[PDB]
Design an enzyme around this catalytic site. Sequence first.
Site, mmCIF file in Angstrom:
data_model
loop_
_atom_site.group_PDB
_atom_site.id
_atom_site.type_symbol
_atom_site.label_atom_id
_atom_site.label_comp_id
_atom_site.label_asym_id
_atom_site.label_seq_id
_atom_site.Cartn_x
_atom_site.Cartn_y
_atom_site.Cartn_z
ATOM 1 N N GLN A 1 -30.024 8.610 -19.224
ATOM 2 C CA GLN A 1 -31.331 8.449 -19.833
ATOM 3 C C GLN A 1 -32.488 8.964 -18.995
ATOM 4 O O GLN A 1 -33.587 9.118 -19.505
ATOM 5 C CB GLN A 1 -31.567 6.973 -20.148
ATOM 6 C CG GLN A 1 -31.093 6.527 -21.509
ATOM 7 C CD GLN A 1 -31.721 7.261 -22.676
ATOM 8 O OE1 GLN A 1 -32.894 7.634 -22.675
ATOM 9 N NE2 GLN A 1 -30.929 7.440 -23.708
ATOM 10 N N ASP B 1 -25.968 5.461 -13.328
ATOM 11 C CA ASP B 1 -25.934 5.971 -14.687
ATOM 12 C C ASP B 1 -27.259 6.652 -14.975
ATOM 13 O O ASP B 1 -28.262 5.965 -15.244
ATOM 14 C CB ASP B 1 -25.695 4.813 -15.672
ATOM 15 C CG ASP B 1 -25.789 5.261 -17.149
ATOM 16 O OD1 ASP B 1 -26.784 5.890 -17.594
ATOM 17 O OD2 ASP B 1 -24.840 5.016 -17.899
ATOM 18 N N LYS C 1 -28.008 14.973 -24.336
ATOM 19 C CA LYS C 1 -29.284 14.254 -24.290
ATOM 20 C C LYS C 1 -30.397 15.060 -23.654
ATOM 21 O O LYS C 1 -31.542 14.633 -23.693
ATOM 22 C CB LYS C 1 -29.130 12.938 -23.570
ATOM 23 C CG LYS C 1 -27.716 12.487 -23.500
ATOM 24 C CD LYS C 1 -27.496 11.451 -24.560
ATOM 25 C CE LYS C 1 -27.736 10.082 -23.982
ATOM 26 N NZ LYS C 1 -28.316 9.329 -25.097
ATOM 27 N N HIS D 1 -25.785 -0.045 -20.098
ATOM 28 C CA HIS D 1 -25.061 0.599 -21.195
ATOM 29 C C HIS D 1 -23.571 0.289 -21.072
ATOM 30 O O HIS D 1 -23.062 0.161 -19.972
ATOM 31 C CB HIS D 1 -25.309 2.117 -21.192
ATOM 32 C CG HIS D 1 -24.785 2.818 -22.419
ATOM 33 N ND1 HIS D 1 -23.444 3.075 -22.613
ATOM 34 C CD2 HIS D 1 -25.416 3.305 -23.515
ATOM 35 C CE1 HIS D 1 -23.278 3.719 -23.756
ATOM 36 N NE2 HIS D 1 -24.459 3.865 -24.326
HETATM 37 C C1 LIG Z 1 -28.229 4.543 -20.744
HETATM 38 C C2 LIG Z 1 -27.066 5.301 -21.319
HETATM 39 N N1 LIG Z 1 -25.954 5.360 -20.561
HETATM 40 C C3 LIG Z 1 -24.826 5.987 -20.932
HETATM 41 C C4 LIG Z 1 -24.681 6.658 -22.151
HETATM 42 C C5 LIG Z 1 -23.361 7.349 -22.486
HETATM 43 O O1 LIG Z 1 -23.551 8.756 -22.737
HETATM 44 P P1 LIG Z 1 -22.466 9.690 -23.490
HETATM 45 O O2 LIG Z 1 -21.922 8.872 -24.655
HETATM 46 O O3 LIG Z 1 -23.192 10.971 -23.791
HETATM 47 O O4 LIG Z 1 -21.441 9.953 -22.425
HETATM 48 C C6 LIG Z 1 -25.843 6.673 -23.094
HETATM 49 C C7 LIG Z 1 -25.744 7.372 -24.437
HETATM 50 N N2 LIG Z 1 -26.801 6.957 -25.345
HETATM 51 C C8 LIG Z 1 -26.631 6.316 -26.647
HETATM 52 C C9 LIG Z 1 -25.258 5.659 -26.850
HETATM 53 C C10 LIG Z 1 -27.754 5.344 -26.972
HETATM 54 O O5 LIG Z 1 -28.612 5.088 -26.097
HETATM 55 O O6 LIG Z 1 -27.820 4.820 -28.112
HETATM 56 C C11 LIG Z 1 -27.095 5.969 -22.662
HETATM 57 O O7 LIG Z 1 -28.198 5.932 -23.474
#
Ligand SMILES: Cc1ncc(COP(=O)(O)O)c(CN[C@@H](C)C(=O)O)c1O
Lengths: 135, 137, 405, 405
Positions: D201, D198, D224, D121
């Site tokens: 998820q 991280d 989440k 991510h």
């Molecule tokens: C694997 C992963 N890492 C890190 C983040 C960052 O989380 P915050 O923005 O809550 O701090 C996300 C957020 N999800 C979204 C962007 C998605 O999977 O579409 C994620 O899915």
Amino acid sequence: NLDTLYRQVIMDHYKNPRNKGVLNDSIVVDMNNPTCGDRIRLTMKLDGDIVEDAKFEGEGCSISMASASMMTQAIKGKDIETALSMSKIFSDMMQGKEYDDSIDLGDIEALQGVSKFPARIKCATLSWKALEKGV
Amino acid sequence: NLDTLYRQVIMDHYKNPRNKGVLNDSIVVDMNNPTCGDRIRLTMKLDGDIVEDAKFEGEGCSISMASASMMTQAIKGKDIETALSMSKIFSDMMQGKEYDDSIDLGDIEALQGVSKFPARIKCATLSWKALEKGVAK
Amino acid sequence: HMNITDIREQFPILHQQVNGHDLVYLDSAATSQKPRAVIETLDKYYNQYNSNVHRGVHTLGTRATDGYEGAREKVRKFINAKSMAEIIFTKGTTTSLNMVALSYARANLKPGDEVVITYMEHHANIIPWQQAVKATGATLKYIPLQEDGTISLEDVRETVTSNTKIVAVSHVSNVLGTVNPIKEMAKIAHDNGAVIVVDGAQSTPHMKIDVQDLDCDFFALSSHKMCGPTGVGVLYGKKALLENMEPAEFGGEMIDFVGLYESTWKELPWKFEAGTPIIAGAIGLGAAIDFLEEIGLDEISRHEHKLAAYALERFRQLDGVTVYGPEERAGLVTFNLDDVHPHDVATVLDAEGIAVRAGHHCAQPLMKWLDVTATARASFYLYNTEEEIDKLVEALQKTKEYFTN
Amino acid sequence: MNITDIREQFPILHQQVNGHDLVYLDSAATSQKPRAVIETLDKYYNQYNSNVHRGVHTLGTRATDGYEGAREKVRKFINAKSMAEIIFTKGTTTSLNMVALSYARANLKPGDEVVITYMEHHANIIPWQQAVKATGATLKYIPLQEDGTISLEDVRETVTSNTKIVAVSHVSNVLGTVNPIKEMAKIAHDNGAVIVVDGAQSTPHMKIDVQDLDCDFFALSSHKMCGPTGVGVLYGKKALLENMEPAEFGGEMIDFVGLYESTWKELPWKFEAGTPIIAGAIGLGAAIDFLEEIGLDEISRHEHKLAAYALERFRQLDGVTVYGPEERAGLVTFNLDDVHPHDVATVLDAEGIAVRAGHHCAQPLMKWLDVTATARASFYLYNTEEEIDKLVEALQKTKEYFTNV
Ligand SMILES: Cc1ncc(COP(=O)(O)O)c(CN[C@@H](C)C(=O)O)c1O
Ligand SMILES: Cc1ncc(COP(=O)(O)O)c(CN[C@@H](C)C(=O)O)c1O
Ligand SMILES: [Zn+2]
Ligand SMILES: [Zn+2]
């Protein structure tokens, strides 16, 4: 009322604290209650495994200073393990807990009332925390 | 159904785009849709205050690419910062409000339909957003 | 104008008992309470259209995104910023000031440069600069204060020099109640080639803010102090300065293109908003802004000035109470009773249902400047009455009598 | 507790979108909230909102007990040894940025390596990009198998004695892969590096035990995991947090403040500057209670069942590629031939179904898959096999609609 917190013995130790001073070849720690109005500097000379004398210097609210006086005077000649057991008993006392009334607290028992005033727990606890960092 | 506001001419421009390619010796802006997935590289070679040729290459949804195609063809030979006036008219068009209709405003208009499906406004605005950064000094 | 009964009726938290007394909440300078408008905004968000924002393709996503960006527009109008590009949603005033110190200060301080602050400053407006100067080799300088706790423009002109790059000052002191001459200070900063950073945590809830008229370069505010949700605040900065500041955080949402080793940033304001934003909090802050605007910030200021004057006059008829700060002030009074430590004062007041703050109210150097270890502070807001001032003064008198008979 | 009861606790589920029952399959972007959590927020703002920690009145005590009790709940939820190792942040992005600011920049020289993955991510990419860039270190990428998994041999090849940090997502938000975090922590430690996980998820969908994982850092987001927006957690091994400088400076995180120097508070408050996210943290504690009562093992078993059902139904539809391996979390990333995922998402939303389309904040992964954008349906505790059936039927209507042109 408020009389169940500011008990006569507490107000006496606030007016006339017992072990006032900072003294000699000793272990000396200082403390400050988060809401900076309580400051303590605790002075303890330890005799092998017992505390021969404890003194303190400070400025702060009634509860903190009275607790410092009562504690310093209730630890004279007691052992380290007895002192830590007293500290744990006091911490339980300021929460809801039952506690082990074996082991005299003396005047310290009077601080039972600030269990109903949690905003002053650290006020009363400052002094004792100085001991737990002392060791 | 309601998705027939995916206008027939729009599907022509997604099917067979107009100004697909590169434009050398000119102004090159590149943009991605906030709603990730639509990419445009908008290239304009201009003759002073007009865009002599405007071309684009990209990858994305039907609406974004079709708006870019229709855009490049309705903006081949455009006049002054009236282009910015077209941009404001388009933005009002996507917020439902009526505009100062017919300053030519070649073609498009079928994007009127995505005043509904607001989740696609950004899709259609991508191309035009590129234009507004193209002129930004 | 303000019907106080109607105003109070909207704040459920006010209508309860504490130790068999009607709650008398005079701690709004620490945090404000929320009207039904705001709480129901949060309810409706989580009940009807919660979804992730911006990157989104479905109906609820569009509703949540429109809510978040509409709140941004509401903030922009609320403080009269030229553009939405200059409104950044943050965690709070602390995070906003730290962003200025990280992204601006460290990139524009070299040895010989000066950061000029005040003796009255909140820790939030002190420590970041302390760190910034120390990372850059610059110098921290303090504008001195008058006897009455105000700042003279002349002392500012003396303190700020051509070597000054940053002047940081609170709009309103949370301890002294002083309303600092921010406009004239911004002019002095600009005449010396410096930018001005305004800690506006304490002014924003109680006063209209116009950043264009103030000509401040940066402005920080906290939602939780202006009837808004916890956990959200605002950083305002002149667009031209934000354009050339690096982001304070890096992640999703704030990027344009990402290579394996390098990335480009989004345009303002999203450059400075990394990750899933504080969605519900920002929407609720917009609701709080609507609420306060409908009441009128100037009307809220008038009400607090009336209560501040009433409180001061009633305080001077109490002997053995020292009030700190000047006559003309915001809606707060910081004081001490002789021979009664502020902790004991706060315990007696809370025993009578009255909520006030005790300690260094996050202004340690100011406490040293007053030669005191701690103070008590009663603060007022739109829902406070003259009757609550009477209850406060009578409780202070009971405190005096109780500790000394 | 049955599926219907679970759905009955989520008010946002029971509404119509374009005359269809809402079919929310975008929990990987954000989760919806149960009645428990929303009412936790309601009760906070209705009864005991006040500032936390240093304060002296009753409401303040209630709010402080709530905030710190939430911290204890988080600690137990992820099995951290001590409360000192649980830091409340704005979210996963802020947590990872704190790691990159406070740890990475203090422990990288030229020659050092930071090792990440192609699947990461953006939140777990850009901060490291910046850190290596400020320190003169080097960023290296663990390659992926064609099926999108990680090989332990690939990590042993990539990780060297020069590696100082390994950062990896616990579960991919695109591929659904569950990475071997434990073995990766072992490899990182064998080469003299720390591991940063991280876990945005993973935390909502599976039990987290930071002690068994032996990860050095772990980041998570409340929004989440049925929790409020705007709050997250940074976990770090106590010994590491002791020697990292704070990421922000201000009130609450200090011990003493002088004009020129300040001392920091002990952990965890060292890293919590200013008025914290009070209501959000308390609501995250409520969400943890809710998820625990259901059981993370039951939520994981349920999501696997639906993932398997979805995969089996998916490829017996022609003309869809699903990306990633057979064993996966509760999400499916896919594409329909000659229909861009934006158009797919619009048709699905016209049938009331919510999915995400494009990048999913993982641009390098998109480049690795040789695709410009993808569609993604994700599942959570409130999703059914019936909604999977509706999704497949809508995908078929999408294909047939875009063939009639
Ligand atoms: C694997 C992963 N890492 C890190 C983040 C960052 O989380 P915050 O923005 O809550 O701090 C996300 C957020 N999800 C979204 C962007 C998605 O999977 O579409 C994620 O899915
Ligand atoms: C004048 C002033 N400046 C700055 C801040 C820092 O804001 P946040 O804590 O919302 O980030 C506060 C908050 N106030 C508290 C700490 C008080 O002093 O009563 C404040 O009153
Ligand atoms: Zn005290
Ligand atoms: Zn698109």
